[PDB]
Amino acid sequence: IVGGYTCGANTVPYQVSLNSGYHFCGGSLINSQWVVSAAHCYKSGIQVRLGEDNINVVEGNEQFISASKSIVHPSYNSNTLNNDIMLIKLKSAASLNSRVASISLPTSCASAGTQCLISGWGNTKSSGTSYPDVLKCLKAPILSDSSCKSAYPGQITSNMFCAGYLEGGKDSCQGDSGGPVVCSGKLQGIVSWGSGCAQKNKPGVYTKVCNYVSWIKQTIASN
Numbered sequence: 531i532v533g534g535y536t537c538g539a540n541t542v543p544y545q546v547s548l549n550s551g552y553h554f555c556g557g558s559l560i561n562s563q564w565v566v567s568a569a570h571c572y573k574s575g576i577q578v579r580l581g582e583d584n585i586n587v588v589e590g591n592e593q594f595i596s597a598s599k600s601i602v603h604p605s606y607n608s609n610t611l612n613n614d615i616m617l618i619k620l621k622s623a624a625s626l627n628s629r630v631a632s633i634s635l636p637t638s639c640a641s642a643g644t645q646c647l648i649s650g651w652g653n654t655k656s657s658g659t660s661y662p663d664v665l666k667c668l669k670a671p672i673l674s675d676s677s678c679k680s681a682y683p684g685q686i687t688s689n690m691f692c693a694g695y696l697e698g699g700k701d702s703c704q705g706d707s708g709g710p711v712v713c714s715g716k717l718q719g720i721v722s723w724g725s726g727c728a729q730k731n732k733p734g735v736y737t738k739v740c741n742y743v744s745w746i747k748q749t750i751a752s753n
């Protein structure tokens with residue numbers, strides 16, 4: 531997260547770290563057996579780390595659970611990153627509590643101007659590299675689709691929104707991939723792509739989860 535702040539240990543209790551020997555992507559717990567993350571985060575050999583604050587120190591609150599199955603969206607295009615979303619099933623249900631909690635799926639999409647919280651363990655430097663060990667958080671608005679589509683001509687689809695600051699300085703980044711964008715208590719976005727991190731006129735693009743609630747509900751019930 532470039533230009534955000536330290537969240538506070540387990541203040542984002544639905545945030546997950548996907549680990550395959552190291553953190554590589556974020557995710558969101560949506561109930562004790564299911565995590566949603568991004569399809570560009572697909573790997574074979576995932577361990578879902580819940581209750582995390584510092585991903586390099588065991589601190590007492592974490593639950594490490596292995597994925598029993600991974601389902602990438604049937605129409606995911608890795609060249610355009612349309613339908614960038616994936617579902618990961620835990621081998622055993624998580625124990626929910628204060629520090630491990632799930633996040634609600636939306637009943638409708640959010641409007642431009644809505645404030646959201648984005649969070650992750652991803653890069654903090656826009657021109658350069660510095661990876662944090664504790665969770666970073668950023669408050670960012672959903673932006674008008676016109677200003678989304680001007681910044682990226684012919685690349686935005688209906689399944690995508692921009693959230694961020696056009697002046698740059700503040701953005702999601704690599705390592706935050708698959709993580710949450712929560713607006714008004716619902717999961718509205720998944721950290722997907724952008725151009726660099728926090729560049730002026732280049733905001734983050736996010737998977738528009740409200741278009742997928744039906745595919746999610748239906749896939750988790752028959753799996």
Ligand SMILES: N=C(N)c1ccc2nc(C(=O)c3nc4ccc(C(=N)N)cc4[nH]3)[nH]c2c1
Binds near residue numbers: 555724734
């Ligand atoms: N090797 C992998 N399995 C891997 C996984 C995820 C990646 N994501 C990227 C990656 O390219 C990337 N994820 C981004 C997320 C947000 C922004 C942003 N500026 N809003 C930019 C990003 N660039 N490379 C990746 C590689």
Ligand SMILES: [Ca+2]
Binds near residue numbers: 588
């Ligand atoms: Ca830890």
Ligand SMILES: [Co+2]
Binds near residue numbers: 570705706722
């Ligand atoms: Co990424």
